[PDB]
């Protein structure tokens, strides 16, 4: 059985614990002996597994914390919808969504920053946004600032609702461990109800709102004299004139005569030629079918009645050809460790974010998204970075599971023990394939540089040279270009047009995804990507597996997950902790995702994004220079970094001056991080003690004793500023370039 299992008033709502800082632990709820107290206060702020050593209080804390995060996300959504309501050119963008830059931010004219309000178009002076929110709102059929305003008030209502819910589910009526530990119900509800009915209700919105309004806007209609969605619901003649399938009603549905519903739930593959997005009929059919799928999927696990599955019953009965006797005890560790679940969920959520980027650049689902090149670049770049970060967090929390929440005595698993046993084979073969990949990708780039510098372009690795053609990806493109004719006859066109064919869905003077070719350079850079991914996996999996013990430190789980070292002995143990491994995997995730988004931006600016002429020949942004310049690192330095970073230096003056500024400042903070990564706490503590002498000599000695940052905190500040500066440099570069060229 799965009861409600909550208790009333576990924690008293009061500001007494607001007053005393660092109340949540033993060594912080005393007061600052030093300035390390503040850093250890913020560091252990959400380390609920360190505050209270029971899963009940931990689970209540993370539940109400998720409510706070949801309140924050709803508040942020309210902000975006409101800035789209009162501080935007959304109407002018709807009237002409090809020459009006999406803008939903206006600056205040105070210190000359008013020049950041650019001529985006539509009688509006503001900042051209890149979140693609205008494209979402055209996919929803908004067509009015009143609707954005009222959904902003609704998102504020939901933010207050989530904040009250967190307060209620911590302080007034909080669940106990019997409520969280049951997961068959959590999965059943999050499948059938969250994701099932969520997709169902979004398909209902689309069937009843998005499809008619977008068909009207595609036919050509001023958004002011467009009928409202409730007119489509109520006035049946109207929606029936849009789609006569509505005239029959749901007796098509309940008599299973769905063939006549194929006027608004088509399987019309490919992109909408009128607007460059996907077909919203296809998307409505999609969300409907996904709703049916997740609704039948959320009735799989046994919760309170006889039917269903036990996840314990599945995992403990899953024998197979390769270590199927295992899988026993995983229900124990996953229902008694929030860090295991956090690691797994972060891994899959970040991988889904990356899947999201890769499927949004190529199958642009919103109207007029593919031709807002800033929107496409920003979305792919963003979700790539988010996915990489979330995977690195999966590493961090796998490690925190391995150190703290791992007991072979009580909670034993055969598979995890077998992984820890041969972990040196794992890391050795992964180190090897990392070296192999580094060589046979980056050394190919170095060979290309040397040969092109020695005047031997016949000896390079290129299409006009020694060819390393991606035969497998080219074969997949050949199949999927021919898939809908034989293998998927329900589709009139392919799922995407990146495969091949005489398909080039231009909406105006802009391309929107012609077929992306795959040459030698794409082989090279895809193997660079496999390389950087494998090195990130090396570092992170190595920290995970060696979080507990090694041949160097066999008592590392007693030192903790997040400790600097075990001293200079054994030669040195400087970055032996699993925290240090995620800290290095962050740098390698940075390298990986940065070369990924560089590949993306250059490939699209050279082979896809561009203008289309009245004769029918496409002129790309860079001009197809990816197959000849992106084989050499000098070409990435010259034809990509030096060439595309002309708009960010000429940005000064026009609206993009901020992107110019945020270039250099980002360039700084990255370098500012190098003060932390290269150095060590000892030098800074001695400098600080000299400065403390200078302060004692003026009766201005502080009582919070100045201490240099912790070693781990120096590394954290370093990787933090490093990622911030590098990523903000790339963000300024990307957005300035693509807003100044497309």
């Amino acid at each position: 059985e799965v009861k409600i299992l909550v208790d009333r008033d576990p924690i008293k709502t009061s500001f007494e614990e607001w007053a005393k800082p660092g109340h949540f632990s033993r060594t912080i709820a005393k007061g600052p002996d030093t300035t390390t107290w503040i850093w250890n206060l913020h560091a252990d702020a959400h380390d609920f597994d360190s505050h209270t050593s029971d899963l009940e209080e931990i689970s209540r804390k993370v539940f109400s914390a998720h409510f706070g995060q949801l309140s924050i996300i709803f508040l942020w959504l309210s902000g975006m919808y409101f800035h789209g309501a009162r501080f935007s050119n959304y109407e002018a963008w709807l009237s002409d969504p090809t020459h009006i830059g999406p803008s939903a931010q206006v600056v205040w004219p105070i210190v000359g920053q008013e020049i950041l309000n650019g001529d985006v178009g539509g009688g509006f002076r503001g900042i051209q946004i890149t979140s693609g929110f205008f494209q979402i709102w055209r996919a929803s059929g908004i067509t009015s600032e009143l609707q954005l305003y009222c959904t902003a008030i609704g998102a504020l209502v939901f933010a207050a609702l989530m904040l009250f819910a967190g307060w209620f589910h911590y302080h007034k009526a909080a669940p106990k461990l019997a409520w969280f530990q049951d997961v068959e119900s959590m999965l059943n509800h999050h499948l059938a109800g969250l994701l099932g009915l969520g997709s169902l209700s979004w398909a209902g919105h689309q069937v009843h709102v998005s499809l008619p309004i977008n068909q009207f806007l595609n036919a050509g209609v001023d958004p002011k004299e467009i009928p409202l969605p409730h007119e489509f619901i109520l006035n049946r003649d109207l929606l029936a004139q849009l789609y006569p399938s509505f005239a029959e009603g749901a007796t098509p549905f309940f008599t299973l005569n769905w063939s006549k519903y194929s006027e608004f739930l088509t399987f019309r593959g490919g992109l909408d030629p009128v607007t460059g997005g996907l077909w919203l009929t296809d998307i409505a059919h999609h969300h409907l079918a996904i709703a049916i799928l997740f609704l039948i999927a959320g009735h799989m696990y046994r919760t309170n009645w006889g039917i269903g599955h036990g996840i314990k019953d599945i995992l403990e009965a899953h024998k197979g050809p390769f270590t199927g006797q295992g899988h026993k005890g995983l229900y124990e560790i996953l229902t008694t460790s929030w860090h295991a679940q956090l690691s797994l969920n972060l891994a899959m959520l970040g991988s889904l974010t990356i899947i999201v980027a890769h499927h949004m650049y190529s199958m642009p689902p919103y109207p007029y998204l593919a031709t807002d090149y800033a929107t496409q670049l920003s979305l792919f770049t963003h979700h790539m970075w988010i996915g990489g970060f979330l995977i690195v967090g999966a590493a961090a929390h796998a490690a925190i599971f391995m150190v703290r929440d791992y007991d072979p005595t009580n909670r034993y698993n055969d598979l995890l023990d077998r992984v820890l046993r041969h972990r040196d084979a794992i890391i050795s073969h992964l180190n090897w394939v990392c070296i192999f990949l580094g060589f046979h990708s980056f050394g190919l780039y170095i060979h290309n540089d040397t040969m092109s510098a020695l005047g031997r372009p016949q000896d390079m690795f290129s299409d006009t040279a020694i060819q390393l053609q991606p035969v497998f990806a080219q074969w997949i493109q050949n199949t999927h270009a021919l898939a809908p004719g034989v293998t998927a006859p329900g589709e009139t066109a392919s799922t995407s047009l990146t495969w091949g064919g005489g398909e080039l869905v231009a909406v105006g003077g802009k391309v929107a995804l012609l077929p992306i070719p795959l040459g030698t350079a794409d082989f090279l850079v895809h193997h660079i990507h496999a390389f950087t991914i494998h090195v990130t996996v090396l570092i992170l999996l190595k920290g995970v597996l060696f979080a507990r013990s090694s041949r160097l430190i066999p008592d590392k789980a007693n030192l903790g997950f997040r400790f600097p070292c075990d001293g200079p002995g054994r030669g040195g143990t400087c970055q032996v902790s699993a925290w240090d491994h995620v800290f290095l995997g962050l740098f390698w995730m940075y390298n990986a995702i940065s070369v990924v988004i560089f590949h993306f931006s250059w490939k699209m600016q050279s082979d896809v994004w561009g203008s289309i002429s009245d004769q029918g020949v496409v002129t790309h942004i860079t001009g197809g220079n990816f197959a000849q310049s992106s084989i050499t690192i000098n070409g990435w330095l010259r034809d990509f970094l030096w060439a595309q970073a002309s708009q960010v230096i000429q940005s000064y003056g026009s609206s993009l001056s901020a992107y110019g500024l945020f270039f250099l400042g980002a360039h700084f903070v990255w370098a500012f991080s190098l003060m932390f990564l290269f150095s060590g706490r000892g030098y800074w503590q001695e400098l600080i003690e000299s400065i403390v002498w200078a302060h004692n000599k003026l009766k201005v000695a502080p009582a919070t004793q100045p201490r240099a940052l912790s070693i781990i905190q120096g590394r954290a500040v370093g990787v933090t500023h490093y990622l911030l500066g590098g990523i903000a440099t790339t963000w300024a570069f990307f957005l300035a370039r693509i807003i100044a060229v497309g």
Partner: protein, 42 residues
């Protein structure tokens, strides 16, 4: 309100209040006296 004035007395809350007030002061001065490079009032 007891123990709210102690929280608002804490270094970050007090720093954000002081720097919000100070930044608004500087911002409104630069609105009143924009584009200043000299002190000509003597």
């Amino acid at each position: 309100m007891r123990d709210l004035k102690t929280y608002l007395s804490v270094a970050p809350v007090l720093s954000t209040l002081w720097f919000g007030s100070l930044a608004g002061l500087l911002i409104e001065i630069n609105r009143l006296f924009p584009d200043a490079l000299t002190f000509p009032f003597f």
